[PDB]
């Protein structure tokens, strides 16, 4: 195709849409050797969903400062906001950092940090994952006596997981204003509230930039689903084989689908019970965040013969189910993820940052 | 703090769709048309189409189909808006109380599907059981048509193809089988409403060729479907396969169809070149049963480029165009002197694509007289609309007009005609039809040196403002492409010049790499090129900036001084600038994805950071700047007068217009702003005060609880700013048709609405001057 | 241990491969080779474990098994 | 060929719209209400009521 004939089609047709205008090449391109500052340890994560802010982070103990930058083509990429991530947290590792946005509620971003292995002798049998939500700098503004200017705050919490759970940044952040965290002993949904409830009808660290407020005011609410209690309740009622069962060792939980409107999240649960012999299942449980748990599938019983490959075969089944049951989500209502593994393409704004 | 008032100086004229049936009663052949929000009901009678009503829906009507359930005497109506409001409406005529009674209404957005590429497809089961809707990819919205007490519990069925071209409910199968074409292969399915799922429908899936686009469900008794598109017209039903590939259907894609005989014996096919085909099905008995022998298509002639076709009685068809003029056309049973079984009867006028307009003063007296450009391929025409009511004189060009401007010195019009020619090995390439460029008095090709497609010949026509014939056609060179045009005086010259922005686009590359700015004069019968300048890139938009020419190349806005030696000279390079508006010293550059940008004399001033695709922008005053985007909206963003807070714009006024606005032009037909959309609508934006804005706002909130709507669509929902990312109520704009409809209600309804201000006749006063600017 | 896998169906992320290659042993890096201009997966991938025995166990554990629309193969000699 | 239909031979033989302003209200009979439940979860529920 062309671009000029595409413009004529737009003029006489009135259906200009970036869905059909997607396989068109991005225009503006830089090697990031002309607009970058410190002429630092600024590793550039990637653009926002809007296209104006660019994010970067500096490791430099390690420190991990996070930086929102305002963009400009002819003039400078001006640094707007610098924020300290995970204060009063003893950090030791390289920390693969992953930042994400909510689908619609774009007033705050969320960032997770995962290392390679824990150091509590460095325990190989643990992993430290950190989380913190931080507000985005409000561009349209209008001494904290003005209301719509104090859109800046912070909430961080560190946890350890035990064989390791799966990062899932499309379903954990599909419900707006709520984050889902698989703590490997529980599943926790955290909801923040600025000034009527997004909850039923771990302990956090909240901060503004450095201070520590009291729990335009902000309140948090967290709901927490414990795996052992729900496994015992689902076995005691929905188990066509559950009489030879005695105990259970290990389980992995994958999130299949999160319905925001019904406030329900589907969790596949790959259990290792004993019934005796080593036996595995693949349960399915629907969780209703508005009040409670409902069963969907209490599946079969199966003998294991490879160690650990039960989990990879099981997660192969989970991605087989989700890749079968996908509905292609829209632009706008999707979750963007920025992570640099150690080029930034804003395909909407057609900007290339080659490295 | 910015207040504007938008009113419709011309209701949209382009036909968005048409349906036929016994709607007003059981016995009267109603023809229903949807023009972009207006549902115009007609009764076929002896003198012709006697128009009954014009019911105005609050939405862009995208699905409009007539279905009759069992036990209903006459047809009900199902309308779906393009904002996913659905309604089922029953006519009721008691002497004069025409009451279009809504029966069903509700929102069918699901907010997590994505918009499918080909469009909304609404289909009704031929035994009235349920309604199928492809709104989103990978999903099928089914509404059961049950009459129990209140609900119609619609649900979804996960279609597993994620790219479906066209889907039809099929005929005569004992359970309702859909039949679709996915990206291509034809599949069927059989819907199970009791369990709400697809079942493997009978007549398993087959392959078709990749440009197939239309599925037609043939009625009883034939069963099965026809798949049409690009020399592939294939009937399929189970065992039965049938194909045909004539050379006639190759040239252009068939765009609509209509069923002539009620048992599917013959069909009507309209395509992009405006031709007309009669698709013929032949019967055979082989006994009892009835089968299809052999398909044949038969041409009928040429009509206007049809968006919807419709056969009406006694051999007349309603060619309901979207680009150009709609038609009632008689099908002659006899031939003609060239092989045309179609003869024209009534040419319903339509503006259609208002690509651009410059409001000029033809005679005198400062009364605005709009000269818009219109049409797409063979029905491009200059429409001259003046206030009366609105008389619209049509000058057909038979080729595409791109932009126009007015050179009042020689009393002439410069316009950009782009005709499509089809290549051959015979010579270079010879055109299709006799058009305006081919019928010129004196033409000249540009003489400056410097198989599956179609070439574009781009010309400047110069057109007299009194007689509107053509005077000279300047044809640009091979693979040249004129984009933008401006008429102005430059430098200290005494004479006015035409300035055209041509590019050289090539089939092998998407991005253009060379173009030239060419400057002509008109020496009273001769168009003489006085300047040319070869620029590396395409010349996208050109504007006069205080005797200097502010050009825009690919992303480089340059400025040109017009030197004394008749030559153009560059000044600077600031780095898709495609709209350039100039109020004195400011420049409002609207990038396609850069929202808006300002410039001064190039010291940048402010920008906007918002996901938009600017169809056009406008400089309202030096503070407020007004843009229309491709999500069918309007928004105004002021300039706040803190250096980061100085280099920023704030979107203060949001308004879901419902149109795709191709051009803004300053002026007034009777300052104000005309916007000329792509449904032919011409609209007016006026600035306001603060207290008048609050007056009209509170009057409108008291008016919305009284003037009931059709389909119960909320006026706070139809006008609320809705793009794909977010939704929010409308601020900073006043829907002028809601307030102009105040004066047409009854006097008890006039005195019932207010109750909380002085009197009521004063409102009758104030609205009666708001109409005096149309 | 170094490994190349290319079989993916233009909808596998770095995270899906991390989750299905993880629970054998400690993993150090996943680099799913995406095509740049489409913003979408090219269909390759270079994943490196920490140790050298879990990648070799993955060679016979996950080779040619159908992932969700197609037979995914694993394989490393030197790559 | 040409045996075209006729609903009425008097139609089109002897060959400006009004605007519908609604004031009075006759109430709405039925409401289109979309089912809330997700497709996979509804499918798994209806399969768990098929074998169980
Ligand atoms: N657009 S999609 O194809 O529907 C789609 C895309 C990404 C995601 S995700 O963020 O949840 N990643 C994810 C998906 C599936 C399995 C796993 C494992 Cl194991 C770890 N992460 C997984 C879900 C759905």
UniProtKB/TrEMBL annotation, chain C:
<feature type="domain" description="RRM">
    <location>
        <begin position="1"/>
        <end position="79"/>
    </location>
</feature>
<protein>
    <submittedName>
        <fullName>Uncharacterized protein DKFZp781I1140</fullName>
    </submittedName>
</protein>
